[PDB]
UniProtKB/Swiss-Prot annotation:
It is found in: Cytoplasm; Golgi apparatus membrane. It comes from Schizosaccharomyces pombe (strain 972 / ATCC 24843) (Fission yeast). The coatomer is a cytosolic protein complex that binds to dilysine motifs and reversibly associates with Golgi non-clathrin-coated vesicles, which further mediate biosynthetic protein transport from the ER, via the Golgi up to the trans Golgi network. Coatomer complex is required for budding from Golgi membranes, and is essential for the retrograde Golgi-to-ER transport of dilysine-tagged proteins. The lineage of its organism: Eukaryota, Fungi, Dikarya, Ascomycota, Taphrinomycotina. WD repeats lie at residues 9-50, 51-90, 93-134, 135-171, 182-221, 226-265, 268-299. Oligomeric complex that consists of at least the alpha, beta, beta', gamma, delta, epsilon and zeta subunits. This is Putative coatomer subunit alpha. The chain holds residues 1 to 327 of 1207 of the full protein.
Length: 303
């Protein structure tokens, strides 16, 4: 495969990127505490947002409201209105670095996870913490809402991936369903497929693991092997039978979803990769690395 780069930002180390679902925008969150809003079709900086001290690793748009959420090493979860360009309020409660924060697609909820070993669920209408998900025994490096079921997946340096049943909160509010064992070092990332009943996880063992789930059980399908340093992030291609991963070995790797064999490696000479994301609808990807952010399309070689 070939990478067709659409946009690049040069900066100090970036930690998170988020695609706007309908505008040609990305948010980027940086190790210097600042958040950038970029139009990647024109190459223009639209705005800058300063509400944190220290790295900002969590960043996400709400799918339909004019809001975004950020999460920092200062322990804050900040909720912003990008149309009025205001910091609306801070959700306080985490006791160590915030690693990931996202919005739910239907309920008025924000998810955040932290080095304090908890996942918190917040109601952004009431501004209250509505649930604290405890049970991990080391940093919680990632968490995600399922796109169509009342489930969360989380990844921890305790070497587990947990799937949590949150149907009680929708209506005990949160109960652990699966404690997925398989990684033999800390887990840095976890992801759901948007339409198939699959989960990806990756971490310090250099492995990307693929899991399948039903309502009643889960199992490990296979492993993508090859990265030669910590894997920072992994995701499913929403529309092609492909897995993507990004690593401190300075590569983005593409793998076959059905055989887990390597398809293509993309390398940077001097930059570790920290995060990758995919647009929900478009064949558009973004990656955060030591020297900034890139937005790219993926095409078949010699197309």
């Amino acid at each position: 495969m070939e990478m067709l780069t659409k946009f690049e930002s040069r900066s100090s180390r970036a930690a998170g990127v988020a695609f706007h679902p309908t505008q040609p925008w990305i948010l980027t969150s940086l190790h210097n505490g600042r958040i950038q809003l970029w139009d990647y079709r024109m190459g223009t900086l639209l705005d800058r947002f300063d509400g944190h001290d220290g790295p900002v690793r969590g960043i996400a748009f709400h799918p339909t409201q004019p809001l975004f959420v950020s999460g920092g090493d200062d322990y804050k979860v900040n909720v912003w209105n990008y149309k009025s360009r205001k910091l609306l309020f801070s959700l306080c409660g985490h006791m160590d670095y915030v690693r990931v924060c996202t919005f739910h697609h239907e309920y008025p909820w924000i998810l955040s996870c932290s080095d304090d070993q908890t996942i918190r669920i917040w109601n952004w209408q009431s501004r209250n913490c509505i649930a604290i998900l405890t049970g991990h025994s080391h940093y919680v490096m990632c968490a995600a809402f399922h796109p169509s079921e009342d489930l969360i997946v989380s990844a921890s340096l305790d070497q587990t991936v947990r799937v949590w049943d949150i149907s009680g909160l929708r209506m005990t509010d949160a109960i652990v369903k699966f404690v997925l064992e398989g990684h033999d070092r800390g887990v840095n990332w976890c992801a759901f497929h948007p339409t198939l009943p699959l989960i990806l996880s990756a971490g310090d063992d250099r492995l990307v693991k693929l899991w399948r789930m039903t309502a009643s059980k889960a199992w490990e399908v296979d492993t993508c092997r090859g990265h030669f340093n910590n894997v920072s992030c992994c995701l499913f291609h929403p529309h092609q039978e492909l897995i993507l991963s990004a690593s401190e070995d300075k590569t983005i790797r593409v793998w076959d979803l059905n055989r887990r064999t390597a398809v293509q490696t993309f390398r940077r000479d001097n930059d570790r990769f920290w995060f990758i994301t995919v647009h929900p609808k478009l064949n558009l990807f973004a990656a955060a690395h030591d020297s900034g952010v890139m937005v790219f399309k993926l095409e078949s070689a010699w197309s």
